[PDB]
Design a protein around this motif. Structure first.
Motif, short mmCIF file in Angstrom:
data_model
loop_
_atom_site.label_atom_id
_atom_site.label_comp_id
_atom_site.label_asym_id
_atom_site.label_seq_id
_atom_site.Cartn_x
_atom_site.Cartn_y
_atom_site.Cartn_z
N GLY A 1 -2.19 5.21 -2.82
CA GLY A 1 -2.89 4.54 -4.02
C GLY A 1 -2.63 5.07 -5.14
N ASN A 2 -2.46 6.30 -5.61
CA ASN A 2 -2.26 6.95 -6.84
C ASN A 2 -1.32 6.07 -7.83
N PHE A 3 -0.72 5.13 -6.86
CA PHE A 3 0.43 4.50 -7.75
C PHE A 3 -0.48 3.38 -8.62
N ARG A 4 -1.81 3.49 -8.61
CA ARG A 4 -2.77 2.57 -9.25
C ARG A 4 -2.71 2.78 -10.67
N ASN A 5 -1.99 4.02 -10.93
CA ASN A 5 -1.96 4.54 -12.23
C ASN A 5 -1.16 3.62 -13.05
N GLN A 6 -0.68 2.83 -12.63
CA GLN A 6 0.12 1.75 -13.41
C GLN A 6 -0.64 1.09 -14.03
N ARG A 7 -2.11 0.82 -13.78
CA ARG A 7 -2.95 0.14 -14.39
C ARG A 7 -3.13 0.58 -15.70
N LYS A 8 -2.64 1.68 -16.05
CA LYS A 8 -2.62 2.28 -17.73
C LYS A 8 -1.16 2.61 -18.28
N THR A 9 -0.31 1.66 -17.83
CA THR A 9 0.91 1.52 -18.30
C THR A 9 1.50 3.06 -18.25
N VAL A 10 1.40 3.68 -17.02
CA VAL A 10 1.85 5.13 -17.14
C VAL A 10 2.98 5.23 -17.78
N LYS A 11 3.55 6.44 -18.17
CA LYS A 11 4.56 6.64 -19.05
C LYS A 11 5.50 7.56 -17.92
N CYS A 12 6.85 7.23 -17.81
CA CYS A 12 7.67 7.77 -16.91
C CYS A 12 8.32 9.04 -17.55
N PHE A 13 7.88 9.90 -16.85
CA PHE A 13 8.00 11.47 -17.26
C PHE A 13 9.62 11.69 -17.10
N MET B 1 0.87 -1.03 0.00
CA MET B 1 0.26 0.02 0.01
C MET B 1 0.93 1.22 0.11
N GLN B 2 0.26 2.32 0.41
CA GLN B 2 1.03 3.76 0.62
C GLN B 2 1.06 4.11 -0.85
#
Ligand code: ZN
Ligand code: ZN
Length: 55
Positions: free
Chosen positions: A4-16, A1-2
């Motif tokens: 939750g915004n990390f859930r963005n990984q569910r959209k193959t987030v892009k490394c800025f 945990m810690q």
RNA sequence: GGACUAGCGGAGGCUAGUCC
């Protein structure tokens, strides 16, 4: 945990940071930088790619 | 607050919703 915004990984987030897909700058191993993952110039960003359009 | 679902983002925050 810690972070939750990390859930963005569910959209193959892009490394800025590097400009890849599968992790974010936060979870990016690379150091906090601002190198355009288009031309490779440190300072500007793809959105403001002074080289070429942004795909 | 947390976790999801969504959604965008050169910056990852924000909100809503549901739950307490
Ligand atoms: Zn990266
Ligand atoms: Zn550029």
């Amino acid at each position: 945990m810690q972070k939750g915004n990390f859930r963005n990984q569910r959209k193959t987030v892009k490394c800025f940071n590097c400009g890849k897909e599968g992790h974010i700058a936060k979870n990016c191993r690379a150091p906090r930088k601002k190198g355009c993952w288009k031309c490779g110039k440190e300072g500007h960003q793809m959105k403001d790619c002074t080289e070429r359009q942004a795909n």
